[PDB]
Amino acid sequence: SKNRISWVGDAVKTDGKKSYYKKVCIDSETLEVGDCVSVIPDDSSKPLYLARVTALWEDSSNGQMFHAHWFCAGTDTVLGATSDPLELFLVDECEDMQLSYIHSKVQVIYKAPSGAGSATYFYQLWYDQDYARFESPPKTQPTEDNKYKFCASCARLA
């Protein structure tokens, strides 16, 4: 909840009706144009709305405002849900909005296209096939007498 709201810096453009700014302080946090921001929906139950702050201005009419450029999640698309809650999509949805509606500052990055990467097998845990369990890998050490042919599973199964 944003209650203490102060402009940071002198105004960058003036409409003679709006006065635009580059930065605003809200509570302790400082927020610039291009930062991203979180908004609680009209339905508190629904997930948070996320947006980029594209402009900050003071209106003769209306007060201390910003323009939200919305993101949307998978569930707002043909896709239904999606594997990662952190996943987001650009969408051409906007709104002027009072700065006091801002829940929190958030971090949204762009994820450039990646390549397949190293296709190698990996393991993390040991499977006790007798008792149907996963443990952390047993740390059974070899001697220097049998290092050259050591099998950890021979060692335990003896």
Partner: peptide, 8 residues
């Protein structure tokens, strides 16, 4: 088109 219509 607006997406947040509450007032407070």
């Amino acid at each position: 088109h607006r997406k947040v219509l509450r007032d407070n």
